[PDB]
Amino acid sequence: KLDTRAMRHLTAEDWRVLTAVEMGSKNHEIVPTPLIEKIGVHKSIATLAKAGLIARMKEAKYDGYRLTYGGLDYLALHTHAARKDVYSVGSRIGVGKESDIMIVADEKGKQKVLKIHRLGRISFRTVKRDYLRNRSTGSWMYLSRLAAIKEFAFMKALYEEGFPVPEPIAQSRHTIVMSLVDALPMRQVSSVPDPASLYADLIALILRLAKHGLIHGDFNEFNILIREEKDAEDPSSITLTPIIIDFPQMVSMDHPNAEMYFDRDVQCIKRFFERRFHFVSTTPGPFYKDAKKTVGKDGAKRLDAALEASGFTKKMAKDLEAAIREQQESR
Numbered sequence: 001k002l003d004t005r006a007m008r009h010l011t012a013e014d015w016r017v018l019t020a021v022e023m024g025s026k027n028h029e030i031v032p033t034p035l036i037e038k039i040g041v042h043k044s045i046a047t048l049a050k051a052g053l054i055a056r057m058k059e060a061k062y063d064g065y066r067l068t069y070g071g072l073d074y075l076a077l078h079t080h081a082a083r084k085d086v087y088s089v090g091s092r093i094g095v096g097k098e099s100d101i102m103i104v105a106d107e108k109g110k111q112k113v114l115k116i117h118r119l120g121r122i123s124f125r126t127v128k129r130d131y132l133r134n135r136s137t138g139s140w141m142y143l144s145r146l147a148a149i150k151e152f153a154f155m156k157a158l159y160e161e162g163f164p165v166p167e168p169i170a171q172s173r174h175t176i177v178m179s180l181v182d183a184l185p186m187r188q189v190s191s192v193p194d195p196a197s198l199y200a201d202l203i204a205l206i207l208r209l210a211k212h213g214l215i216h217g218d219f220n221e222f223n224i225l226i227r228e229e230k231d232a233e234d235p236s237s238i239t240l241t242p243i244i245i246d247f248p249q250m251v252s253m254d255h256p257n258a259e260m261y262f263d264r265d266v267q268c269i270k271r272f273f274e275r276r277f278h279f280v281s282t283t284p285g286p287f288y289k290d291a292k293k294t295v296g297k298d299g300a301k302r303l304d305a306a307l308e309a310s311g312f313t314k315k316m317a318k319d320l321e322a323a324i325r326e327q328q329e330s331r
Contacts, residue, residue, distance in 0.1 A: 184226060250304075
């Protein structure tokens, strides 16, 4: 897991040397002692190594220090601290299949969410956790950086167009800080006074996404949060509104597979509404053939351009795309 105990106990030199290990691994994954120097720092290497923020590799041909996942976490947190976006870290933590969730708070006591991407995660069960070794440590960190940058740019673009998504607050490396929404995942919602209305809201979102050029792609029910507003005129009235999360897997309506991602999203919703609330829609579709005409009409901004807006090369985009598809295909 993520153990942030050693956080305060690191010196400025430590923060400098750990940062050097990171920069040094922009080129080579196993960073030699003398290269850390160019970027007495020996006492720092010892502290960071005992803390498990770096690890020595003396294999045979290669000799030096690789950055660990913990170390990448720490440097992300430190950046968030330095910019006063995060001042404290909460005891409650969410360990997901492809990400982790920590609750944090700023100096003014405002609680926020720190999401950490964890592409490549795999857990092993004894027959009588770790990361998939088909890629190096630096690949997974790289890919996870890409996932964080992608999600945050789409979160920004969606928040700015008025979609119901968490406020993106900050991004560093493989992490994002975003607002802490008061809404609970749909899967943990028991029943609804008006399933048709909520369904009509969800489909509307998917069509809104499509008119702006986007397909969520993994619209599960850990991804759809429900907000519950006790109406003021009568507190017996409850209105529910949906909030969407999880954006590094979004694809363009222009994608060669757009049509299967679109209808999958739609059918998933219908499927969930079918089993969980015994509700089924009388409206057919919506179908992608139709949706595709709406993008990107009526002056709807093409939000799927938010990526080239942010120095994402074609390589990076395809690099990430392959990593994600491989993730979802191996659940």
